[PDB]
Design a protein around this nucleic acid. Structure first.
Length: 49
RNA sequence: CCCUGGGGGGGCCGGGCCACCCCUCCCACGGCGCGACCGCUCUCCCAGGGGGCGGGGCGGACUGUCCCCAGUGCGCCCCG
C-alpha cells in the first residue's frame, strides 16, 4: 500500500577534500634532482670526513 | 582657302565626361606608429656564474640514502 520510495532531500552539507591530488610534472621532476642532490651530499661529505 | 565643267582641303554649336593644372568624400591594398579587448607564455630583468614573472595575502597540499632546513605545483586577489 506504499511502495513509492520518497527520498531524503540530500543536501545538508557542502565540503570537498578527502584524498590526494595527482602531483604535476614539475613537482615530480624536481623530486628527482632533490634526491640526486641528497645522494651526492652523503657521497661527497660523508665519505670525505 | 588652294589647283584648274573638273580637283584638293578648312570648316559651321552646343552638351557633359575618361580626363588635361588648382581645392574635396568613401572604399580596396601596402607600410609605420597608437589605443583597448582576447589568447599565449616567459625574455629584457633581478637578489660572468646564477636566480623567476615577482611580491603579498586567504591559503592548501606536497617533496628530502633525511644540508630541518630547503624546494615544487595548484586555487583565488592585485601590479609587472
Amino acid at each position: 500500500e506504499n511502495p513509492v520510495y520518497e527520498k531524503k532531500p540530500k543536501k545538508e552539507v557542502k565540503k570537498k577534500r578527502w584524498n590526494r591530488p595527482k602531483m604535476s610534472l614539475a613537482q615530480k621532476k624536481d623530486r628527482v634532482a632533490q634526491k640526486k642532490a641528497s645522494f651526492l651530499r652523503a657521497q661527497e661529505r660523508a665519505a670525505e670526513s
